[PDB]
Amino acid sequence: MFRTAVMMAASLALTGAVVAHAYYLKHQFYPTVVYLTKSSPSMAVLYIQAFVLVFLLGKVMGKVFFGQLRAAEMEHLLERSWYAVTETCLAFTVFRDDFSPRFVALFTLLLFLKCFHWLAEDRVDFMERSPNISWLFHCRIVSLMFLLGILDFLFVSHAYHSILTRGASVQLVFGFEYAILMTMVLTIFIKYVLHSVDLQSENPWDNKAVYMLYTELFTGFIKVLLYMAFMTIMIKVHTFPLFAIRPMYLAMRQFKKAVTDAIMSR
Amino acid sequence: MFRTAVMMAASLALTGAVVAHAYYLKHQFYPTVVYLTKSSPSMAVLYIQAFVLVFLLGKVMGKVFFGQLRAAEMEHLLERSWYAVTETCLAFTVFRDDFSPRFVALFTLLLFLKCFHWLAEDRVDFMERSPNISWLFHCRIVSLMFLLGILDFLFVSHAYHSILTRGASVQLVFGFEYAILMTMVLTIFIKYVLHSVDLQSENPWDNKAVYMLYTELFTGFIKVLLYMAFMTIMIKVHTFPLFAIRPMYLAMRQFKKAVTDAIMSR
Amino acid sequence: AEMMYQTGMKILNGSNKKSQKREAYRYLQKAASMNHTKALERVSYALLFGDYLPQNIQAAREMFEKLTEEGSPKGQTALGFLYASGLGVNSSQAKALVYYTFGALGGNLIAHMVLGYRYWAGIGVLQSCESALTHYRLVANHVASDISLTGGSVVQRIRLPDEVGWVDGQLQLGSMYYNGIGVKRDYKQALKYFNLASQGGHILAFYNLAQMHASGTGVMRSCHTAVELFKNVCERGRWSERLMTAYNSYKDGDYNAAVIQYLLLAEQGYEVAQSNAAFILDQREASIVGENETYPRALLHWNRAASQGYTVARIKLGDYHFYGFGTDVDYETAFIHYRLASEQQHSAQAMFNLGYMHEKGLGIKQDIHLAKRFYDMAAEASPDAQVPVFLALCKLGVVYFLQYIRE
Amino acid sequence: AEMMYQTGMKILNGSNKKSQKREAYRYLQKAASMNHTKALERVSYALLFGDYLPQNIQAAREMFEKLTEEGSPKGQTALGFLYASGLGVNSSQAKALVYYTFGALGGNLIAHMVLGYRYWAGIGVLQSCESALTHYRLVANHVASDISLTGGSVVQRIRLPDEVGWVDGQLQLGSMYYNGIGVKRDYKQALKYFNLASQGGHILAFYNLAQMHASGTGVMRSCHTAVELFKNVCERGRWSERLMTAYNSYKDGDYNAAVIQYLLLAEQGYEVAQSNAAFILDQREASIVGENETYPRALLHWNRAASQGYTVARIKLGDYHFYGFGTDVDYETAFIHYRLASEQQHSAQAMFNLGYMHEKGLGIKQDIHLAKRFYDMAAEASPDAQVPVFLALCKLGVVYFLQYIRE
Amino acid sequence: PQLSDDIPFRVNWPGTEFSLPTTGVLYKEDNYVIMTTAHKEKYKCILPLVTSGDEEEEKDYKGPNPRELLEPLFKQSSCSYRIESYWTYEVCHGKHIRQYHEEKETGQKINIHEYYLGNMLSNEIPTKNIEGQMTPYYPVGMGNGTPCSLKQNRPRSSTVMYICHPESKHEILSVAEVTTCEYEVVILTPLLCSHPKYRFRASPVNDIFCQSLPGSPFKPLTLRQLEQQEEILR
Amino acid sequence: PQLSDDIPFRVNWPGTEFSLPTTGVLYKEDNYVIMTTAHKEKYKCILPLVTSGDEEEEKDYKGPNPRELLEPLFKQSSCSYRIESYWTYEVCHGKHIRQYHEEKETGQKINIHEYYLGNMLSNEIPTKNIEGQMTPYYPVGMGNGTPCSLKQNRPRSSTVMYICHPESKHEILSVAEVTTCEYEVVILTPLLCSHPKYRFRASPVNDIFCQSLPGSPFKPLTLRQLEQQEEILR
Ligand SMILES: *[C@@H]1O[C@H](CO)[C@@H](O[C@@H]2O[C@H](CO)[C@@H](O[C@H]3O[C@H](CO[C@H]4O[C@H](CO[C@H]5O[C@H](CO)[C@@H](O)[C@H](O)[C@@H]5O)[C@@H](O)[C@H](O[C@H]5O[C@H](CO)[C@@H](O)[C@H](O)[C@@H]5O)[C@@H]4O)[C@@H](O[C@H]4O[C@H](CO)[C@@H](O)[C@H](O)[C@@H]4O)[C@H](O)[C@@H]3O)[C@H](O)[C@H]2NC(C)=O)[C@H](O)[C@H]1NC(C)=O
Ligand SMILES: *[C@@H]1O[C@H](CO)[C@@H](O[C@@H]2O[C@H](CO)[C@@H](O[C@H]3O[C@H](CO[C@H]4O[C@H](CO[C@H]5O[C@H](CO)[C@@H](O)[C@H](O)[C@@H]5O)[C@@H](O)[C@H](O[C@H]5O[C@H](CO)[C@@H](O)[C@H](O)[C@@H]5O)[C@@H]4O)[C@@H](O[C@H]4O[C@H](CO)[C@@H](O)[C@H](O)[C@@H]4O)[C@H](O)[C@@H]3O)[C@H](O)[C@H]2NC(C)=O)[C@H](O)[C@H]1NC(C)=O
Ligand SMILES: *[C@@H]1O[C@H](CO)[C@@H](O)[C@H](O)[C@H]1NC(C)=O
Ligand SMILES: *[C@@H]1O[C@H](CO)[C@@H](O)[C@H](O)[C@H]1NC(C)=O
Ligand SMILES: *[C@@H]1O[C@H](CO)[C@@H](O)[C@H](O)[C@H]1NC(C)=O
Ligand SMILES: *[C@@H]1O[C@H](CO)[C@@H](O)[C@H](O)[C@H]1NC(C)=O
């Protein structure tokens, strides 16, 4: 806890130093803020402060939504988040959208929601094998389920009305990624429905595994369909993605690990 | 092996269909090759046949330098390689170097050499715990030691004369990355030197671990110095990397796992 | 009869619709049956031209004859075009000129441009700049009058072998400098002020320097600059809109009306309309001309398009002598037309195929190290020659290495 | 004496080196001791100007007096500049004009531009366009003559508050249209052809329309266009190079010679040299002027720079009445100069500070929903107002929400 | 230096035998300068004390009250309007203030968004401002306009501002609001410039007199002349 | 149509009583056309058979051998040179070919890279394709130049190509190489154009005589006003 406060103070000291340097130069409100926006190191330090703020908000949201990290999903977050920040960075830079301080914020919002879906993934994965779970866990995780699903529905609606009204831009890829995240909250619902009808009966159910495999096959098909439509759109319009082929290979492997295993079983 | 020959033939069937499409359009030598260059799908299939050709050359180079993959480094290449495919892809597009089919071919030369350094690391890591190693293994891996380190010395020499004669361009990040790869062949040498004096004596040596921890401290200090100088340059000239912070956090963690462990030990 | 012609011109000038233009000509075609000598000459140039009336070349030849026997300038001009191009009728250059002279005599302006162009490039007659000065002059006076009235209708120049205020006042100031408005006339310095007005693109200045180089005022009267300055004025008449009537026929799939509406302007002496009227005959899309008179007629219009300074028409005159298109195969003759597009126009391809005739010993005696120069020269001339020289130079060194092994 | 002045002008015109220019003036400074009446006027304009001789204002005042008693136009002009600017001497506008009149009488051109500008902007005298017509002409005749000889030496216009052929022949054609060269004169149509020549940027055309709007030829003679067309001709003399002599003093760290070499051109009636001569006095870098006469003198040159149409000089005249710089604090007076830079010049900042006086109830009565309009209007006017309105509108709604809770 | 760009000056040449006026601006015998022209003509130009104080202009007015001058403007019903970037203000002097904008539909319809800002059913003249400077005015204030939603359906009010201009043709400098849905209109008229307390205020001119020294004429050997030279172009 | 842009034509007006020539080009009585001008003027304009065959021009030449014509060019020592993009070829007629290019150093030195291509210590005239045309030439072949590294220190050789031009001033059309380090030079001269077998070949002109039908005069009424009009303009 000491190092977190040390990092926050060491970021706020630089932010205050940059703000005071600008205010000593241009002694008013409006030229000071305009000078902050045009200057590169000033906006860089403001970016650093914004990232530390969203980091602390993420930490308090993880504290209020999960009681304690298992220290086995913290790594899974670290590699998958590196994956993700590099994919968002490359998608931001190929599209020639230019560095704007209101679309970087949207991209970190997308990354933040992706991290929370992955945390929900691993929490329900341990809920599969947890014999002692209180009602607080159930209520908080189903609150996470809703909130996430409603958020991706809202952003999908916003992005498809954007792609209808404005024209071809980055809002299309934003809406498609939020549609994939919508399929993700769909997967965990069905998984939580099956593992909740598992716990309420003091006997194992053989049909639960079949339903889980069928649902995984389902949504794997939906995911590869979305990725293929995503491809066949951006070869046609703008430029080759050069990104999003990462989780696609994992999406076809998700289809491979579900369809072929069910074919070998059934 | 059947799926490998299928993949080669299904790529060469597309190249022989793209070439025969252009030759019917422009019935000569010179306007055909020019037509392939300017056309996007014609250069796309010629890119695919190039990558399959460098894939099969890698598989035959892996077959002659390593007798058999252990199927524990086969995964370990796949995440790193992905790591490496994406950051070269992001460094290629951030720099505005434009898509040229002789600098893409240079970037996959870096990635092809980067994959072979990583394969040498995991092979020498099990050279620590292999009590039955033939003289064929010893000679075929010091050949990989020489062939790599001379190659990065050549490309560093090609790049630091390119940074002086021509000016600031993408040839700076090539020779710097090969300099890190020059430290990478430096690491596996000393590790091979200390583990060769281990096998020739039928008794463990306590100073071998002390030299190994000192050697990892060494080069780790060299590595962060290379990355930190790599930071200070491209903020000054051109633009923010937005890449190469991937292995840097692993480079500080390499320095963290070496210096702090030695401080705790000694 | 005469009442029918008024309805057609009213709907033509009043309606730009394609159906209304064809509906206007229905009375005009009916008035042609009444032998109104003004009525046929507007449907003669549709019966054989297309994109108006349906194309029927044999239906226009016999009624052109009565236009000739009447003595119409618009009939004497076009019947010469039939025998010059061998179009529906056996080709004869002998009396193709006879019809064009009487059309030029009769007051037609097309028969003066072609007769002038034939006297200028030496086609069908002796190249005489004196005779090419006289006929090109009469067109220039009859087009410089109308541009000052019509405002200079500009038309785009489209070449199929490539795809498929501030200065207005300077003309009057330069006119006063040569003539003298309040100052003594000075022909030594009024030349530079008048010549700089033509670099803006206006063709009124193009006329005034032609007369300057004609009578010998200011600069000594040279033949080469006398008519070349005249010619670019004549290439922008009301017949300059006829590329669009021909080019729209090419995009509409009527390829046999883009080879007749282009062969007139090829006869009129263009280079946008002499490559394009040969490129269509290059790919055998035309059907009026036979399958055996398709390449020699496309050789004629590739030859005129090269002598007027076109890069592709000098490479593509090398190809027709390289493979044997319309001529017995000549590697020596094809050799020259490839170098003439290398030293003169610096065409990047034209030294690559110079390497092939150097590397493989065609036309001249083989030398391996001479061929290396022209492949290397190709990469310096263009950015697009970097690739197809590299796969040619690698093949070049394989022969040199394999021959050295056998020794 | 006279032999010493020849050596200085030879090295000045022969060597452009800074040391050689100072070495040339060593004989000129020694010749000033011999009271050669041509020698002092080249060193009087260095003793008080700088970037030549070392700057010493008091060392030039007493030797200007003997230049006045001799009756030198170059001494009568500059001695009025001392009392107009209060420079080293107590300020007095009363006989500042008296010295400028006799300099204008004496044949000096600087004393005519300043007297003309004072009659044009109504500074020190009544604004009379008739008197501003007379003095601004004499300069225009004496500058258009040399520009035809010197080629019109262009000088860049540098404002410190921001950082720190084809038409040549149209002038002679438009001159012949008004006068008549072989045609009847028509003043109704020669106006449009002559006025279009000035849009190219050449200033010979700027002279010729000024006389056109002076005598009433073509268009009725209006005062506003009579001298404004005249003025931009006068602002491009051989004294237009004096920005670079002043601007180089600013970049070389000699800030006290960029406030004297700029205050003359501020007196001469510029706007590049009236903001910059006030921006230097804004930050108190000047040392000749006292610390208590630094803001009222910078208010005077911010006031003249605003009435000549500058955006920043109208915002920065709001600031000086907003905080209380050089004046007792006036929120009502500062209010007007902020909106006069909003409706007129559409300065993006000038409606943001309109919001602050609307939101916080300064100058006028407070109204919360009126302030919302101008913050919103700020974001429409510029791309850079998107940020500092958003943190202003969020603060705006916090007060509106917190007040509603207390109710 | 303090607001020094408002003090007018004038040089005169009254000659040798001249007496400085004792009425108007004050004078001194020490603040004289000895002058010299280019052709060696000597002059002695006296200058007044720069005060121009008080308002002792003998302000008398037996004419009509300021109410009576705008009556012929009211009955003639000739009233103007002003354009803006978007809006269009039509003040009608003696009837109303009307603010409206036409919405031109695609081909057939024209839609009007109209509002009503008013309708006609003390020893010191107040002074507002006007472009920074100073001007006494006539205020004409009304209300009972269209209801304003921000003031909870209260009718708008408006004050009419009258300032005089000689070349005016009844136009508007600007329209402005001191608060929401209550607007201020300034109107140019030529009627009030005859009123001494309502006319455009001009500062008194301080006269600079140049006494001709002996050996120099009544006016300098370059004056008169050069003046008449342009007298050509008069 | 086959190479038809090399056949000259000429219309003449010999009139009513004219007999077609039996020497030169062949004629027929069937290939006549009946003509009509704009002013209703009838003409019968006959045409020849377009053969222009053989070389029966009675080729006789009692003059000197072609060797003797270039001797005054050799002794006068007036010889030219040609520029290119990089190189500079200086052929000297009767002495040498010199190929060199100057390397201008930064201020003081000039470096010369020079080579030597030569030095002077049959019933059918051969012809070479010149721009695809048929010109017979005089070859002057010569060697013993500087050694060539590609041919293992063999001296270069060169042939001098002579073709005639009336307005020539001893310049070069182009310099070309048939093989490595052995070069070909073409030279324009006016001396060989007097030689009947060496002159510039012009095809014989086929004459279009045309006879005037009764009711029409010797020349058309719309013709003679035009050749006098250009005669005035000249
Ligand atoms: C080039 O020219 C273009 C046009 O000439 C410029 O384009 C802009 O075009 C937009 C159109 O989308 C204009 O925006 C608004 O237009 C109408 C009209 O709304 C205006 O009027 C509102 C009236 O409210 C006040 O009315 C009285 C005025 O006397 C007051 O007494 C009263 O109390 C009240 O306050 C006004 O409110 C509004 O201004 C702002 O209002 C609020 C807060 O006040 C702000 O938050 C807003 O941002 C707004 O800017 C407008 O000035 C409007 O339609 C209205 O009427 C329809 C009727 O059906 C309603 O349905 C609708 O909901 C709305 O109420 C539009 O919706 C839109 O809001 C804009 O004014 C134009 N801009 C300019 C500068 O003219 C373009 O800018 C020009 N290019 C440049 C300058 O570079
Ligand atoms: C704008 O103008 C510029 C100049 O006007 C153009 O710039 C180019 O500039 C470069 C300079 O770097 C030139 O390149 C070469 O220049 C010299 C000279 O080498 C030339 O001559 C060589 C001679 O070899 C032949 O000589 C005889 C000729 O009669 C033959 O008989 C003999 O057998 C032999 O074949 C010639 O070989 C060479 O051409 C090519 O040679 C080989 C194979 O033949 C190719 O692989 C090469 O690629 C080469 O192009 C040249 O034409 C050269 O210096 C030489 O001499 C120094 C002396 O110290 C040696 O040290 C050095 O090693 C070398 O031997 C240069 O090194 C360089 O190779 C080039 O010619 C210019 N280009 C043109 C078109 O003029 C610029 O191109 C212009 N811009 C345009 C057109 O857009
Ligand atoms: C054209 O000439 C050929 C050969 O003389 C002949 O066979 C043919 O019938 C002629 N055609 C016409 C239309 O005259
Ligand atoms: C040439 O013309 C003949 C008609 O006599 C036709 O049959 C033939 O196909 C044409 N082409 C060739 C190549 O002979
Ligand atoms: C300027 O005037 C002030 C006040 O009248 C006086 O104190 C000062 O001495 C004067 N200075 C000069 C140089 O005349
Ligand atoms: C004004 O002038 C006086 C000199 O009398 C000086 O002492 C003072 O510092 C100056 N400034 C102020 C603010 O009084």
mmCIF file of C-alpha atoms in Angstrom, chain D residues 76-194:
data_model
loop_
_atom_site.group_PDB
_atom_site.id
_atom_site.type_symbol
_atom_site.label_atom_id
_atom_site.label_comp_id
_atom_site.label_asym_id
_atom_site.label_seq_id
_atom_site.Cartn_x
_atom_site.Cartn_y
_atom_site.Cartn_z
ATOM 1 C CA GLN D 76 13.372 68.595 -36.356
ATOM 2 C CA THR D 77 11.739 65.210 -36.975
ATOM 3 C CA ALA D 78 13.511 63.253 -34.242
ATOM 4 C CA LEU D 79 13.364 65.958 -31.563
ATOM 5 C CA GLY D 80 9.582 65.797 -31.808
ATOM 6 C CA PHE D 81 9.790 62.033 -31.324
ATOM 7 C CA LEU D 82 11.561 62.620 -27.998
ATOM 8 C CA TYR D 83 8.759 64.804 -26.642
ATOM 9 C CA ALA D 84 6.012 62.646 -28.156
ATOM 10 C CA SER D 85 7.357 59.519 -26.439
ATOM 11 C CA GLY D 86 8.639 61.304 -23.309
ATOM 12 C CA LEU D 87 12.019 59.730 -23.964
ATOM 13 C CA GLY D 88 14.744 60.952 -21.609
ATOM 14 C CA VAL D 89 12.793 64.201 -21.302
ATOM 15 C CA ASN D 90 9.472 65.172 -19.692
ATOM 16 C CA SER D 91 6.579 64.270 -21.974
ATOM 17 C CA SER D 92 4.728 67.057 -23.771
ATOM 18 C CA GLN D 93 2.346 66.545 -26.686
ATOM 19 C CA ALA D 94 1.932 70.329 -27.002
ATOM 20 C CA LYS D 95 5.190 71.055 -28.839
ATOM 21 C CA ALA D 96 5.671 67.505 -30.061
ATOM 22 C CA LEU D 97 3.455 68.564 -32.965
ATOM 23 C CA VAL D 98 5.380 71.833 -33.394
ATOM 24 C CA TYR D 99 8.631 69.979 -34.100
ATOM 25 C CA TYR D 100 6.890 67.511 -36.423
ATOM 26 C CA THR D 101 5.304 70.335 -38.434
ATOM 27 C CA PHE D 102 8.646 72.008 -39.125
ATOM 28 C CA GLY D 103 10.140 68.630 -39.975
ATOM 29 C CA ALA D 104 7.205 68.129 -42.332
ATOM 30 C CA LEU D 105 7.860 71.637 -43.633
ATOM 31 C CA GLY D 106 11.613 70.977 -43.861
ATOM 32 C CA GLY D 107 11.148 68.183 -46.411
ATOM 33 C CA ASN D 108 11.560 65.154 -44.156
ATOM 34 C CA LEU D 109 9.417 62.161 -45.068
ATOM 35 C CA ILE D 110 9.190 60.641 -41.580
ATOM 36 C CA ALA D 111 7.673 63.846 -40.196
ATOM 37 C CA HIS D 112 5.018 63.673 -42.934
ATOM 38 C CA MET D 113 4.042 60.055 -42.218
ATOM 39 C CA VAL D 114 3.711 60.771 -38.495
ATOM 40 C CA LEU D 115 1.818 64.023 -39.075
ATOM 41 C CA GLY D 116 -0.370 62.204 -41.583
ATOM 42 C CA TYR D 117 -0.994 59.312 -39.193
ATOM 43 C CA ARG D 118 -1.802 61.705 -36.363
ATOM 44 C CA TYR D 119 -4.361 63.373 -38.636
ATOM 45 C CA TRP D 120 -5.771 59.973 -39.651
ATOM 46 C CA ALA D 121 -6.313 58.168 -36.340
ATOM 47 C CA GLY D 122 -7.066 61.462 -34.579
ATOM 48 C CA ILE D 123 -4.066 61.253 -32.234
ATOM 49 C CA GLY D 124 -3.040 64.606 -30.795
ATOM 50 C CA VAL D 125 -5.228 66.472 -33.320
ATOM 51 C CA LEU D 126 -8.720 66.380 -34.798
ATOM 52 C CA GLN D 127 -9.365 63.456 -37.139
ATOM 53 C CA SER D 128 -9.516 65.223 -40.510
ATOM 54 C CA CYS D 129 -9.264 63.047 -43.617
ATOM 55 C CA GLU D 130 -8.621 66.190 -45.687
ATOM 56 C CA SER D 131 -5.461 66.941 -43.701
ATOM 57 C CA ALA D 132 -4.637 63.225 -43.613
ATOM 58 C CA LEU D 133 -4.934 63.208 -47.410
ATOM 59 C CA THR D 134 -2.370 65.988 -47.869
ATOM 60 C CA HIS D 135 0.434 64.649 -45.674
ATOM 61 C CA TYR D 136 0.026 61.004 -46.703
ATOM 62 C CA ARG D 137 0.390 61.934 -50.335
ATOM 63 C CA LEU D 138 3.708 63.545 -50.178
ATOM 64 C CA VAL D 139 5.122 60.300 -48.778
ATOM 65 C CA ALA D 140 3.504 58.161 -51.488
ATOM 66 C CA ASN D 141 5.065 60.181 -54.317
ATOM 67 C CA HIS D 142 8.497 59.864 -52.684
ATOM 68 C CA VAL D 143 8.237 56.097 -52.133
ATOM 69 C CA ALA D 144 6.624 54.844 -55.369
ATOM 70 C CA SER D 145 9.407 56.607 -57.294
ATOM 71 C CA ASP D 146 12.248 54.737 -55.564
ATOM 72 C CA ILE D 147 10.382 51.400 -55.497
ATOM 73 C CA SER D 148 10.263 51.424 -59.311
ATOM 74 C CA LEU D 149 14.063 51.853 -59.120
ATOM 75 C CA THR D 150 14.912 49.627 -56.135
ATOM 76 C CA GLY D 151 12.421 46.904 -57.098
ATOM 77 C CA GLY D 152 10.221 47.199 -54.012
ATOM 78 C CA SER D 153 12.307 45.709 -51.192
ATOM 79 C CA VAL D 154 9.925 43.428 -49.268
ATOM 80 C CA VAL D 155 10.276 43.124 -45.481
ATOM 81 C CA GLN D 156 8.617 40.501 -43.278
ATOM 82 C CA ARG D 157 6.084 41.604 -40.639
ATOM 83 C CA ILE D 158 6.936 40.062 -37.251
ATOM 84 C CA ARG D 159 4.541 40.318 -34.303
ATOM 85 C CA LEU D 160 5.992 39.341 -30.935
ATOM 86 C CA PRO D 161 2.664 38.700 -29.282
ATOM 87 C CA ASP D 162 2.112 35.792 -31.694
ATOM 88 C CA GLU D 163 5.454 34.025 -31.129
ATOM 89 C CA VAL D 164 7.511 35.516 -28.299
ATOM 90 C CA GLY D 165 5.226 39.034 -63.911
ATOM 91 C CA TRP D 166 1.630 37.892 -64.318
ATOM 92 C CA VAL D 167 0.195 40.956 -62.545
ATOM 93 C CA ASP D 168 3.010 43.395 -63.398
ATOM 94 C CA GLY D 169 1.713 43.723 -66.955
ATOM 95 C CA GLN D 170 -1.827 44.193 -65.636
ATOM 96 C CA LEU D 171 -0.795 47.510 -64.063
ATOM 97 C CA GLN D 172 0.274 49.009 -67.401
ATOM 98 C CA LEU D 173 -2.839 47.625 -69.112
ATOM 99 C CA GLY D 174 -5.046 49.167 -66.429
ATOM 100 C CA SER D 175 -3.117 52.428 -66.718
ATOM 101 C CA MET D 176 -3.869 52.563 -70.452
ATOM 102 C CA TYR D 177 -7.560 51.792 -69.872
ATOM 103 C CA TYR D 178 -8.093 54.835 -67.642
ATOM 104 C CA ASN D 179 -5.930 57.215 -69.689
ATOM 105 C CA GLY D 180 -6.768 55.962 -73.181
ATOM 106 C CA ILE D 181 -4.294 54.286 -75.543
ATOM 107 C CA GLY D 182 -5.978 53.924 -78.926
ATOM 108 C CA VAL D 183 -9.463 53.715 -77.368
ATOM 109 C CA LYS D 184 -11.952 56.050 -75.731
ATOM 110 C CA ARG D 185 -11.438 56.439 -71.992
ATOM 111 C CA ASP D 186 -14.025 54.775 -69.740
ATOM 112 C CA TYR D 187 -13.704 55.418 -66.002
ATOM 113 C CA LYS D 188 -16.633 53.092 -65.231
ATOM 114 C CA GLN D 189 -14.894 49.904 -66.426
ATOM 115 C CA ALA D 190 -11.211 50.796 -65.963
ATOM 116 C CA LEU D 191 -11.792 50.792 -62.190
ATOM 117 C CA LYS D 192 -12.464 47.045 -61.986
ATOM 118 C CA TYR D 193 -9.426 46.128 -64.093
ATOM 119 C CA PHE D 194 -7.148 48.401 -62.054
#
